[PDB]
Amino acid sequence: ANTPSAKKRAKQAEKRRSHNASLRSMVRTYIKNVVKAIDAKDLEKAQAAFTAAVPVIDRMADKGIIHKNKAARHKSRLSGHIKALST
């Protein structure tokens, strides 16, 4: 960089990336738990994982880590998969 503004922006951007990566991995792991539970044909596990995973998905969409459309899509598809599994 050549000016102080660029250096400060680079420093702040590195901090932002460090903060955001952990939360994104959090959301991914919470979704993957539900996906694995569904793939194993386990109902009670599926409801437990879905109930644990919906609040974090909504909270992280609200914080701005992901877009709310993605949260709605994930919720809809997980709900459909679980409801189809129950029958």
Partner RNA sequence: GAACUGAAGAGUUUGAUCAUGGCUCAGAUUGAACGCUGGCGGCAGGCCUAACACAUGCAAGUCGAGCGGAUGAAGGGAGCUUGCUCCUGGAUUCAGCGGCGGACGGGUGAGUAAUGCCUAGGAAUCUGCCUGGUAGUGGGGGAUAACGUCCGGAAACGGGCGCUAAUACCGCAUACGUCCUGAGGGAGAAAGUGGGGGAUCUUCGGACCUCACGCUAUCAGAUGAGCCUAGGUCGGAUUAGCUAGUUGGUGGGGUAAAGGCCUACCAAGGCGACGAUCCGUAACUGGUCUGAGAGGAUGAUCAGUCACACUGGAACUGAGACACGGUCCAGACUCCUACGGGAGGCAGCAGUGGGGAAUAUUGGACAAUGGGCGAAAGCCUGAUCCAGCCAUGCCGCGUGUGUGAAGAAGGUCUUCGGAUUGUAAAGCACUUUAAGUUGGGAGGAAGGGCAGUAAGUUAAUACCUUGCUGUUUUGACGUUACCAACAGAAUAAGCACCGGCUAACUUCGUGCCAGCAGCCGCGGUAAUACGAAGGGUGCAAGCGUUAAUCGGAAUUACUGGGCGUAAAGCGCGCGUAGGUGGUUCAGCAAGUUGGAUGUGAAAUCCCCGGGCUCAACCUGGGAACUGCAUCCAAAACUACUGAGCUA
Window 22 to 81, contacts with RNA (CB under 7 A): 23, 51, 54-55, 58-59, 61-64, 67-77, 79-81
The pair of structure tokens assigned to 51 is 């109930």
Asked if 32 and 41 touch (Cβ cutoff 8 Å), the reply is no
| Smallest separation (angstroms) from RNA to the CB of 4 | 6
The pair of structure tokens assigned to 29 is 């792991």
Give the containing element (helix H, strand E) for 29.
Answer: helix 4-39
**Using CB under 5 A as the criterion, which residues of the chain lie in contact with Mg ion when the complex forms?**
62
**Using CB under 7 A as the criterion, which residues of the chain lie in contact with RNA when the complex forms?**
1-6, 8-17, 19-21, 23, 51, 54-55, 58-59, 61-64, 67-77, 79-81, 83
